Every structure is written in structure tokens, then in C-alpha cells.
Write a protein that binds this ligand. Structure first.
Ligand SMILES: O=C1Cc2cc(Nc3cc(Cl)ncc3Cl)ccc2N1
Ligand SMILES: O=C1Cc2cc(Nc3cc(Cl)ncc3Cl)ccc2N1
Ligand SMILES: [Cl-]
Ligand SMILES: [Cl-]
Lengths: 4, 122, 122, 4
């Protein structure tokens, strides 16, 4: 999971 | 402020390909000369300008069989259908001309672009 | 010896979401309490262990309406349906409990994992 | 396009  | 799962799109496409290999929820047969290809209309639309136009048509959206132009090569179609479901293109010296012509007909602009680049290099 | 188009899976998912927003080729309504959600069975199956089981069932595969358990919160479902079609999860302090419970019911293991991690941190 |  990432910060888009 | 959403978070994003990097592998989600690839995992979705992988599962759609697994459904295709097992013939699950396929709703159309694409006829190319004597050859028949089962697929999901939504995946075909998402990948191809031609299928997008066909299945948004109020009459054609309800057809279970679509016949392609007799000039279309079944192998070129098969390579492109595999690319739609995997992101992988089996581009070879012996098939590049049939793949580019099929991608132009199907309106798959990124495939047409790489075929033109690969032909130019040789 | 294939070549790969990096953005293909993301572009496919983006087009499937565009079809969903325009209600094109949607083939099921998911009922959550009073709320109704239109979707594509194949996308639901590709994202959820629960929908995968439902639509591979020889009887349920043909249903146009699926009613979820009355304990399921419509907002939690909506956030998860959006994630299925975009890879983006709108996880907030006020919805995390409803999102985790809905993801556990839908069998969306990667969402359950991030919810457990975010709860543990607080 | 890449070599996967
Ligand atoms: O090279 C290409 C690939 C492609 C895909 C689609 N399919 C869609 C496009 C839009 Cl805007 N919304 C939804 C869909 Cl399914 C149309 C044209 C082309 N051209
Ligand atoms: O967390 C999850 C997400 C998920 C998705 C699917 N869907 C498939 C799985 C296979 Cl192997 N082939 C095809 C499909 Cl559509 C099943 C279980 C789970 N669990
Ligand atoms: Cl393309
Ligand atoms: Cl997940």
C-alpha cells in the first residue's frame, strides 16, 4: 500500500 | 486522502485471465476465419476501440457471436487476445506484420506504436 | 520472449470503472440494506473470495440480484466497490471498523491486512 | 514497454  | 494497493490492477487482470482459461462468465465468441475465441465483452471493450464501439451499440451489445473481417489472421487475433488478458505481447519477426494489422483493425493504439517502432529498427 | 506494457492492467481497470460509472454492461445489482449497487460480476469475482464463490455456483451464477447479510453497512460496501474498480481505498478513522468487517465478509484479504495494520497503529 |  502507498500514498498515490 | 485514499491509500493505494500497487498490485491490485495486475491481480484483477490475472483473475480475469483465469476466468477466461476456465471459460467462466465468458459472454461472447469472436469468429476469425474458421477459428473461435471465447471472451468477456467488458475486457474486449476495455482493450480495444473496435470492441468498445461494437458493444456500446444498442443492437450489437446483445450479440453472442461477432464475426471479424475475413482479412484478419486468427494467430494475430490470438496474440492480441492474450495481450488483453495479460499485458504480455508475443511479438516475433514472423508475426509482427499480422499483429500490427490486427491491432490497427482492433484499434489498440499502444500495440500499433510498439509494432511501428520494432519494424523501423529492422 | 514476450514484451510487456507496464500501464496495461491499470488502463484496463480504469476503462472497466468508466463502464461502471456509465452503467454499461453491468449484469448484477448488489443489495445492501436499502441501498443498491450495480456492477460487473467478473470484476466482483476478480476482487472478492465471496463473489468468486457466488458466481461460480451453477444456480447463483444466473441471478441478477444478490442480497448481502443485513449486518453489512452500505457505506463500507461502497468504499470497497470503489477500491475494486480503482485500487484506491478511502480508509478513515470513522469508517475503518465498517470497512474491515465488510472486507472480511467479502474475503478481500489485502484490505483486511491494511485495516488490521492501521487499527494496531492507533 | 519492458522485458518482463
Ligand atoms: O487504443 C485503444 C484502447 C481503447 C479502449 C477503449 N475503451 C473504453 C474507453 C473509454 Cl473512454 N471508456 C470505456 C472503455 Cl471500455 C476505447 C478506445 C480505445 N483505443
Ligand atoms: O482476497 C481475495 C481476493 C480473491 C479473488 C478471487 N477470485 C479468483 C481467484 C481465482 Cl484463483 N481465479 C479466478 C478468480 Cl476470479 C478468489 C478469492 C479471493 N480472495
Ligand atoms: Cl493497446
Ligand atoms: Cl483485497
Amino acid at each position: 500500500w502507498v500514498i498515490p | 486522502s485514499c491509500i493505494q494497493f500497487t498490485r491490485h490492477a495486475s491481480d484483477v487482470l490475472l483473475n480475469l485471465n483465469r476466468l477466461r482459461s476456465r471459460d467462466i462468465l465468458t459472454d461472447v465468441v469472436i469468429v476469425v476465419s474458421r477459428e473461435q475465441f471465447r471472451a468477456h465483452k467488458t475486457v474486449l471493450m476495455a482493450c480495444s476501440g473496435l470492441f468498445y464501439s461494437i458493444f456500446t451499440d444498442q443492437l450489437k451489445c446483445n450479440l453472442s457471436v461477432i464475426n471479424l473481417d475475413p482479412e484478419i489472421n486468427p494467430e494475430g487475433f490470438c496474440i492480441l487476445l492474450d495481450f488483453m488478458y495479460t499485458s504480455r505481447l508475443n511479438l516475433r519477426e514472423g508475426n509482427i506484420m499480422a499483429v500490427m494489422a490486427t491491432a490497427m483493425y482492433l484499434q489498440m493504439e499502444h500495440v500499433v506504436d510498439t509494432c511501428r517502432k520494432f519494424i523501423k529498427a529492422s
